[PDB]
Amino acid sequence: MTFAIKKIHHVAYRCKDAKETVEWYKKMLNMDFILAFAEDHVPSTKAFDPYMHLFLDAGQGNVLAFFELPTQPEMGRDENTPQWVQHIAFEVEDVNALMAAKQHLEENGVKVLGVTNHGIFHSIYFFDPNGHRLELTYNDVRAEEKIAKITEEMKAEMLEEWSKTKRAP
Amino acid sequence: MTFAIKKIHHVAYRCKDAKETVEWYKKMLNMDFILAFAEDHVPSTKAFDPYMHLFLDAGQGNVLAFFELPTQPEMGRDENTPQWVQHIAFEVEDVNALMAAKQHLEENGVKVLGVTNHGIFHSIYFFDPNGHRLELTYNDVRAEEKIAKITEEMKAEMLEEWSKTKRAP
Ligand SMILES: [Zn+2]
Numbered sequence A, B: 001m002t003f004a005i006k007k008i009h010h011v012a013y014r015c016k017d018a019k020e021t022v023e024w025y026k027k028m029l030n031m032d033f034i035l036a037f038a039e040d041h042v043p044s045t046k047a048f049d050p051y052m053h054l055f056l057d058a059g060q061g062n063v064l065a066f067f068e069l070p071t072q073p074e075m076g077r078d079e080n081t082p083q084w085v086q087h088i089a090f091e092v093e094d095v096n097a098l099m100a101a102k103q104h105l106e107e108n109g110v111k112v113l114g115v116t117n118h119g120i121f122h123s124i125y126f127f128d129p130n131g132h133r134l135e136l137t138y139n140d141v142r143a144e145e146k147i148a149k150i151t152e153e154m155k156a157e158m159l160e161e162w163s164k165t166k167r168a169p
């Protein structure tokens, strides 16, 4: 291979209101507003169809990005997929940070589920003001040791068995 | 604030076939398979409803994650939102890496759009085997200088004007 992925540059979703979204992510998660692009038409088309594209700081140079499309029909969803599948999780340093976040969100009126033990990490869950599913998580102190038990042979075997049976291997 | 977001921990989407997805991301983008969770029922429910949750290495500890839900109705989409809105972009080091990636993808039969100049970064676009919109990008050498021209006052003003008019400020 002549190239390697460095990191996630940005992950983009639709939002209902750019200013309300910027304000919420700053207030609830201290995520700073980096920049915005905006145009009154979609590239290569003439028709009036404005958008605002916003970048938010998600840490270590990662960006959480939104588009507001004020002349498009209201955002919907993939009705064939459960809500818990599509989500974004952000890492916090440790349990003290996760509990701090949980308390802060609750004090600001956000319903928070958790803490949930996923073995290699521990998480809390809440919705953003656009209905996106968010997760905050910290890695278990023994996470790398538990992951390292998965050998390349086990990975191959698990995928093959799953491909054959579509039951948990 | 008593906590800070460190980075994106994982971003999750649905995939149609776990093994084909793992194989494609390794072949096309050299993204390694880290681990998988699988169960035959969704937590807290009894009914047969298996899933496989896979983590792929997206660089610097970021994870691109997928779920395969083999007993659910086929994946769909939000029909009220254009395809170009929801997407994920991964960073490459520089133009040589982006052109290497473009050539590699094309040699493996992937249609690639680009290179597109976005001023602060340069990008190529292609679909994954699940219909997700992918982007590879490298940052312009003067990107930080161009972004630094946006003062906190300009950000406030742009959001206020946009909130009022819903036209590009
Ligand atoms: Zn998760």
Ligand SMILES: [Zn+2]
Pocket: A010, A012, B087, B089, B135
């Ligand atoms: Zn993009």
